Amino acid sequence: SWPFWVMHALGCIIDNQRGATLSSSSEMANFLNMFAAVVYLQNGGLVTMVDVLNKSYQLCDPMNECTPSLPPLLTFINQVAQNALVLASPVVLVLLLSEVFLGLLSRFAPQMNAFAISLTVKSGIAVLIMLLYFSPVLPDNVLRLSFQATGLSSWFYERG
Amino acid sequence: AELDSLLGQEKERFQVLPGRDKMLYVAAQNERDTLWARQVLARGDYDKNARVINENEENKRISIWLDTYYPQLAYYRIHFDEPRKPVFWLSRQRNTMSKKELEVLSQKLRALMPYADSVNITLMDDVTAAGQAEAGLKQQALPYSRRNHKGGVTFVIQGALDDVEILRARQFVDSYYRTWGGRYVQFAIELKDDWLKGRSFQYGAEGYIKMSPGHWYFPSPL
Amino acid sequence: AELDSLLGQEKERFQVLPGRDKMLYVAAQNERDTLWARQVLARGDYDKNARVINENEENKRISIWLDTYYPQLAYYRIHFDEPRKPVFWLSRQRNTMSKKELEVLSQKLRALMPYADSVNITLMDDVTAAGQAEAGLKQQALPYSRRNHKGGVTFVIQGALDDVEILRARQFVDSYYRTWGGRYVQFAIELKDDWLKGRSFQYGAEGYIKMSPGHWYFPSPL
Amino acid sequence: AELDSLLGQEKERFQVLPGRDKMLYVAAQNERDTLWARQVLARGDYDKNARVINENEENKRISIWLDTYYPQLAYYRIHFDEPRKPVFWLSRQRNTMSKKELEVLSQKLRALMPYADSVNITLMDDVTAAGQAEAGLKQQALPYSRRNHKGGVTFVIQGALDDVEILRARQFVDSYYRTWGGRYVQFAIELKDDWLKGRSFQYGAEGYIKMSPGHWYFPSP
Amino acid sequence: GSGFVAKDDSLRTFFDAMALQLKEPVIVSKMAARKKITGNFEFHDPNALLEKLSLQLGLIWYF
Amino acid sequence: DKDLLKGLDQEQANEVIAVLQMHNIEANKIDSGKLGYSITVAEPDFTAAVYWIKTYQLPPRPRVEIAQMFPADSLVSSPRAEKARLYSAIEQRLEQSLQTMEGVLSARVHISYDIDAGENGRPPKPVHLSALAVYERGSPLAHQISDIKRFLKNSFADVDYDNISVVLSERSDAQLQAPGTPVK
Amino acid sequence: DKDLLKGLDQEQANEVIAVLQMHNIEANKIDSGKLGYSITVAEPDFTAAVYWIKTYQLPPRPRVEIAQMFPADSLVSSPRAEKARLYSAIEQRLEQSLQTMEGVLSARVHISYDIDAGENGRPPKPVHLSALAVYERGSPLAHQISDIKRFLKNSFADVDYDNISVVLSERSDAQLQAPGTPVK
Amino acid sequence: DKDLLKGLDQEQANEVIAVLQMHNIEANKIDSGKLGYSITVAEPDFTAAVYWIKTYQLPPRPRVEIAQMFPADSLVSSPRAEKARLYSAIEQRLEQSLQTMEGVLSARVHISYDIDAGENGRPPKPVHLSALAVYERGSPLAHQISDIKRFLKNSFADVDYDNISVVLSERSDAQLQAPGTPVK
Amino acid sequence: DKDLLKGLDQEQANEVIAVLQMHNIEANKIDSGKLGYSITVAEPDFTAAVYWIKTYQLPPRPRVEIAQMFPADSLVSSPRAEKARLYSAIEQRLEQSLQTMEGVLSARVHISYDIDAGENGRPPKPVHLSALAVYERGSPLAHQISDIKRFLKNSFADVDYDNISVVLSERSDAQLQAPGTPVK
């Protein structure tokens, strides 16, 4: 569940930056998770999903006590985190530069209440900037982050 | 001035021959020096008549006359090692011309080359022309196949040859062509993909049998 | 303006021979000194005529004449260790020349080389040209395969040689070509990997290659 | 000035010899001093002609001359320990030259080396040349394999030699080549890795190497 | 004139190549089909080569 | 003294002069500095010069490469636009490496482009190459076709000897003499 | 008198001089300050000089490398954009290392580019090489074709001797004498 | 005084003079301050000097390292762009430690790089080395390969002697005499 | 007096003079302030010194250490980028610690670098070393190979006695006498 987790983490950041989640202190992040589920499912998909559990019996046969090999497990959370932040890189930069560009206009006109205008303009920006790189850039990282069977040796070892 | 001082610094790479029809022939030796002397005669700093000849192209010039006035003639190559008395290598086992008939050809070949004085026609054997080609094709340890038929032979080298067997073969063909010429024996170097370099067998019921040489080849899985 | 002062400071790498047809000859030793002398004669600070000779160039120049006027001749190499008396190494067991017409060859070669005062013709043996090439090839412990055929032998060195056996086999061939020439015996060093690269096979008169534990290939009998 | 003052301050490493062809030969001892002596004669601070000779280069010039005019000759080396009377080491059990035709060789060799006055030809034996190489190769405790054939022998050293044996082998071969030369006996050092490191094997007549608990390897006999 | 050149075979590919010099087909079991072999062999006296290999490898055979 | 082409540049004017001088008409190249070159011919040669312009379709357009339609200055780049920019640089590099062989004056190499296989589950297809060449004359150009196929075969991942096609030809006869001025 | 090229570079000017001096026409190189060099010829040699400009496709283009089309200034860098810049520096370092051998004047090396094999589950293919070389004459160039194969063999991960194809040749005849001035 | 090249730096000028003096022509190294150096030859030497410039591909380009394509001043560096900067400094240190042996004057060492191992879970392959060397002449250069293969063997993780290749050669003949001025 | 090189620093000029004085030519070390040093030789001694500059690849480059590729001033440092500095500081400390032995003038040590055996679950491979040394002459340099191995065996975790290779040699003959000026 690696590339679905980072894609669902992508949509939660894009939902959270534009407002729309500040009732705590989601549908958009569900949309990318379904989309990367389908584009993973089309080309190949279940053949490599079955192949990694067919290799797991080739390297973790029971009555041998294999374990999930702890010392590379401890970098798992940041392994998806550094894939989350660089994938959410370009749209939070435009939303953040637009906010301080509006803030200099609030410094040039004091009773503007530019906080109210920020909710109106960010939801258009957060879909517009991601429309330029939604088509040619997103779906190849989905196939790149799919965990392949050759790396199954690095996550396990049998104990006797 | 004179023509042999309007050329380059060394008077060693060219040779100026007097013509019988009041022309001045310049005998170069390769293609790069042929345009060296033709650029001089082309820009026009010489008040008289001159022509630039060469071994490769005046051997092609008097083969157009020969296959108009003497068809079905058996010959190999014309050698210009001494350009005032060239040697005409004629075939012995395939001509019926007598002594009187060879002398009209010797005079009508003198008339095509006005710089020459007399053309010496000599006769070579047809079995030492294919024996030197087979012994040279066997000294390089090259895979080959000989196809004898009437009026010429041909040697065929096929297969997925490696990089050494192309350089040793190509260094030998251009050194054989300068001596004999491609009138009698012709080489057929060609690259396709089969590790059996040319040969092909079929297997049934006793061992292997060598099939006849054919044009189709089996592509190799390996 | 003498010629011996126009060259470099050390007067030991060149040697000027007076020809009989008014032309001085500078005999170099390798290609670097040949270009050192051709730059001098090319810029033109010497008003008389001069030519630069060599050993590898002069040995390829007078084999074109010998492949036109005296074909089917068995010879090895022409040595210029004393440039006024060269030595022609003729073969003994492969020619049919008498005593009289060898003087004709010794006079048509003297008129062909103007710096030479006289040419000496020695008859070298034929089995000592291949027994020294086999005895030198046995001291380096190299695997080889001799192929005897009519009028030339061929030593084939194939396989996956290592790094020291290529340098040791390259130092011997270039020391043999300097003394015997590449006319009679030919060395064929070819570097190729394990044929049938990882496949088990059953060789000899009924052969098959095993492409897989369940796949048979029946090419030519391995 | 004269030539022996244009060289360095140490007037002991070079030795000038007057030639017979009106020259002046300088006899260096190695390649570090031959370029020292040839820089002087090359920049041109000397009026007459001179040359710089060497021990190993002159030992290749008259061997290039010798394989044109005197082929099928069996020799080892010509020694120049005193450069005015050199010593020629001819072989005995491989040639059939009489006394009358050994003076033609000693008189035609004199005209090639103008600095020398005479050449002293001695006939060395042929079995001591290969017996001193075997006894010198056994003293270093080296695995080897002698291959005898007609007109030369050869020694092949193979294996996973360690660092003390690939330094004692260079210190013995470079000390033997200086004396006899590589005409008769030739060494062949080639080092490969050991296929039996963590492997169990059987040695003797029926030898095999167990590359795994379930994998046998029967090598070539 | 004959011989097999084994490069990491599996004792079922191998002993079927000897099934021509032996005039009978060979049937190897599946527990004896896991052992492997390499080497240049030569089938000139196979009834003594099969006996020598069955004791070095560790096998039992019946004809 | 009748101009026919103006506003050209340096590489186009040396091709128009070399084409018109082959067909026995003179030409004058008049530079104009910033405005480019200009070409005039004589008055009896103007009717023939317009005909040779229409037949050879002069002035020549600049040569197109595949990496011009996918420039590197864009903000984003698809994988189709990255493999097309890779193949269009190898296609020029083999062209500049074939001109250093012995006798070849000009050459052009073509590679088969693949787009659809890199995205779906279909395996990639075989690779096809095609080359053209112009040789110096006097060469026996039937034996020269095997060195090019030997060089071009394992300069790529997986090609065969029958997916490469070499077509080559010797250069034309040299033109060295002057055309000549129209006397009247 | 008449100019035929101007605005050339430095290395572009010496190639035009070295080609025209081979065919017995004499040219002159004139500097123009910041506008580069310029090359002029005489009056009767102009017709042949345009013919050798057209045949040899002069002036030469600057040579192209694959790392030029994947610039390092981009803040994003795909793995297709890192392996192409890694291959393009190895096939320049092996080329500069081949010129230090015994008797080699020039060389050109090509590597097989594999970029789309690591993104899917497909295994990487083997790597192929190809090389050209120009040797100093007097060399027996049939025995030095196996030292380049030995050096190029274990400079990579795992190649075979079938994947390496080196084809090389000897240099042309040396040009040392002056062309000569056209008198009229 | 015809000018051949101008604007060259210090290391570019010493190779041009070291090449021209090998073929019996001399040059002059004239300094110009900020505009680099300049090299002039005579008029009868000009035709030969422009020929040896084209053949030897002079001026020499600066030598390329793999650590230049991946600069260390970037913000973030991938693991693919970190082992390439490690291996490029190791292969530069191994050829600087080879010049301190006895007899050696120059050396060049190459390592096989890992590409797929940065992104995959596959184990890496064996590392291959390859070396060139130039030895001072007179040395028994046949026995000198066994010391370099022993030194190069255990300078890495695990190699074997079939994966190391040394191709070495003796230096050229010494050039010690002056060319000579062309008198006319 | 023609100048060979200029702009060199202190450590380079004492290497160029130490090489030219070995081959019987003089040299002058001229200071220039902040613009470095310069070196001038005589006019008959100019053709030899250009040849030895080209042969010995002079002036020498600064010696590369692996710690120069991974600077300490980075904001984030990987574990991959910290073991390279840790190996490249033990590699310098054993090199500075080998000079304190009896007879050694110079030495160089090479550790086998592993960075890729850390993140995975595979066990780390054994570590190999390789050392060079130069001894003063008059010493039995075959018996002194056993204590460099004894000193290097247990400076790390677990090496064997056959994973270390020491290749050492004695120094050349001493050059003490002056070259001598050319007499004119």
Swiss-Prot record, chain A:
Key words of the record: Cell membrane, Membrane, Transmembrane, Transmembrane helix, Virulence
Any one GO cellular component localisation term in the record: plasma membrane
Main subcellular localisation: membrane
Membrane topology category: Multi-pass membrane protein
Entry keyword Transmembrane helix: yes
Keyword field contains Oxidoreductase: no
Intracellular or extracellular location(s): Cell membrane
Bilayer-crossing regions: 1-14, 30-50, 85-105, 114-134
Record-stated family: Belongs to the FliR/MopE/SpaR family.
Function as written in the Swiss-Prot or TrEMBL entry: Involved in a secretory pathway responsible for the surface presentation of determinants needed for the entry of Salmonella species into mammalian cells.
The protein, known as: Surface presentation of antigens protein SpaR
From Swiss-Prot, chains B, C:
Membrane-topology annotation of the record: Single-pass membrane protein
UniProt entry keywords in alphabetical sequence: Cell membrane, Membrane, Transmembrane, Transmembrane helix, Virulence
Domain of life according to the entry: Bacteria
First-listed, main subcellular location of the protein, grouped into a coarse class: membrane
Gene Ontology cellular component terms for the protein in this record: plasma membrane
Subcellular location as annotated: Cell membrane
Summary of the function given for this chain in its UniProt record: Required for invasion of epithelial cells.
This protein's name: Protein PrgH
Native organism: Salmonella typhimurium (strain LT2 / SGSC1412 / ATCC 700720)
From Swiss-Prot, chain E:
Family to which this protein belongs: Belongs to the bacterial secretin family. T3SS SctC subfamily.
Chain's role: Component of the type III secretion system (T3SS), also called injectisome, which is used to inject bacterial effector proteins into eukaryotic host cells. Forms a ring-shaped multimeric structure with an apparent central pore in the outer membrane.
Organism phylogeny: Bacteria, Pseudomonadati, Pseudomonadota, Gammaproteobacteria, Enterobacterales
Protein's name according to its UniProt entry: SPI-1 type 3 secretion system secretin
Residue span relative to the full protein: 32 to 94 of 562
Encoding gene (name): sctC1
Disruption phenotype: Insertion mutants are hypoinvasive in the HEp-2 cell assay.
Domain of life, source organism: Bacteria
Subcellular location: Cell outer membrane
Subunit structure: The core secretion machinery of the T3SS is composed of approximately 20 different proteins, including cytoplasmic components, a base, an export apparatus and a needle. This subunit is part of the base, which anchors the injectisome in the bacterial cell envelope. Forms a stable homooligomeric complex. The complex is composed of 15 subunits.
Source organism: Salmonella typhimurium (strain LT2 / SGSC1412 / ATCC 700720)
Swiss-Prot record, chains F, G, H, I:
Primary localization: membrane
Keyword Lipoprotein appears in the UniProt entry: yes
Superkingdom in the source lineage: Bacteria
GO biological process, one term: protein secretion
Annotated coiled-coil segments of the chain: none
Keywords: Cell outer membrane, Lipoprotein, Membrane, Palmitate, Protein transport, Signal, Transmembrane, Transmembrane helix, Transport, Virulence
The keyword Transmembrane belongs to this UniProt entry's keyword annotation: yes
GO cellular component, one term: cell outer membrane
Topology within the bilayer: Lipid-anchor
Compartments it resides in: Cell outer membrane
Main function: Required for invasion of epithelial cells. Could be involved in protein secretion.
Protein family membership: Belongs to the YscJ lipoprotein family.
Protein name from the UniProt record: Lipoprotein PrgK
Record organism: Salmonella typhimurium (strain LT2 / SGSC1412 / ATCC 700720)
Shown residues in whole-protein numbering: 20 to 203 of 252
